[PDB]
From a paper:
To elucidate the role of intersubunit interactions involving Leu46 on the structure and stability of [name], we compared the structural stability, and biophysical properties of wt, L46A, L46F and [name] mutants at the secondary, tertiary and quaternary structure levels. To understand the role of Leu46 mutations on the three-dimensional structure of [name], we also determined the crystal structures of L46F, L46A and [name] huMIF at 1.70 Å, 1.70 Å and 1.60 Å, respectively. Similar to the wild type species, Leu46 mutants crystallized as homotrimeric proteins with dimensions of approximately 35 Å×50 Å×50 Å. In agreement with our previous structural studies, X-ray crystal structures of [name] variants demonstrate that the Leu46 mutants conserve the same three-dimensional structure pattern as the wt protein. Static light scattering, in agreement with the analytical ultracentrifugation data, demonstrated that wt, L46F, L46A and [name] exist as stable trimers. Finally, crystallographic data and enzymatic assays do not show any drastic conformational change of the catalytic site or activity of [name] upon Leu46 mutations. Using hydroxyphenylpyruvate as a substrate, we showed that all Leu46 mutants are enzymatically active. In our case, chemical shift measurements demonstrate an extremely high similarity between L46A and [name] huMIF, whereas the L46F mutant exhibits a slightly different chemical shift pattern. Thus, decreasing the hydrophobicity of residue 46 (via mutations L46A and [name]) destabilizes the hydrophobic pocket and results in distant structural perturbation that is transmitted through the backbone, affecting the tertiary structure of the [name]. Taken together, our data suggest that the intersubunit interactions involving the residue Leu46 play a key role in the structural stability of [name] and provide new insights into the role of a novel intersubunit hydrophobic pocket in modulating [name]’s conformation, stability, and potentially its receptor binding and biological activity.
Numbering used by the authors:
A (entry chain B), B (entry chain C), C (entry chain A): 1 to 114
Write the structure that this text describes.
């Protein structure tokens, strides 16, 4: 699985530890070994939400399965919680797009997961 | 709706007010309320289009509904128009990927739009 | 087709010519003229793979068709090979998401490809 965060919060406000924290919390939440979890956080971005440049985040979670109605509500609670606590972003200024990827459509190690 | 623009145009050449103009014109085009529109502009990117480093852009528009054949033609004319006028990028060096997101696959405010 | 690479490899470790090499190699791989290929390389990223900040990449390939089981295995071998050779990233530290776009969902030059 892969989780990408894009945010207008400054780099200095992103805690050391945050990438590892997301890795651990996603590994637990998705049920997948942490070895497969990739995380990417992009601060200092030129973005607006609702026409305002108050702290916000645009995120994506891609997984091969483990994506669906209730699972996504649960990931949204977990991930908005982490963003509010660690980056001080209001949950109502966060979007997370969820992508259920086909195994044949994810490349890794010179091949795919199919 | 969420609209992201990645470009090799330098940050000094993105005018004041561009994020606000995009938010407004996206609200005019999709008819969704401005309060829910997110916009993100990433300049100074290492990009080529057709093997050339002349000004170009790669963009994405995600929306829950309001995506389709004639709608996306209308969005493309609006958005290439804004990129040409404001960032001086030729329309034929712009790609925009359109994504019709399932409400259940969009997280916000600790939950989803389901 | 559009190929995007995000990596923690530093800018100075990205060799001259890389965007043209990726344009040429993807044009031959997808059997399309290079005038259609857009490439985007983003170094210096705050990212981890499996909880480690060793060199890694998160990439996307979007195309109108030419996306499938065998085709995606072939693109992964080519692209992991280029990232290992040029950026010194281990193939088992690369994810590539593949997207078969419908023509109606790709904007270009004030309209779509539909």
């Amino acid at each position: 699985p892969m989780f990408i965060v894009n945010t207008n919060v400054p780099r200095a406000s992103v805690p050391d530890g945050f990438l590892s924290e997301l890795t651990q919390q996603l590994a637990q939440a998705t049920g997948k070994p942490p070895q497969y979890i990739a995380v990417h956080v992009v601060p200092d971005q030129g973005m607006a939400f609702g026409g305002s440049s108050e702290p916000c985040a645009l995120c994506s979670l891609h997984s091969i399965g483990k994506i669906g109605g209730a699972q996504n509500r649960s990931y949204s609670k977990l991930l908005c919680g982490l963003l509010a606590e660690r980056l001080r972003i209001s949950p109502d200024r966060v979007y997370i797009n969820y992508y259920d990827m086909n195994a044949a459509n994810v490349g890794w190690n010179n091949s795919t997961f199919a």
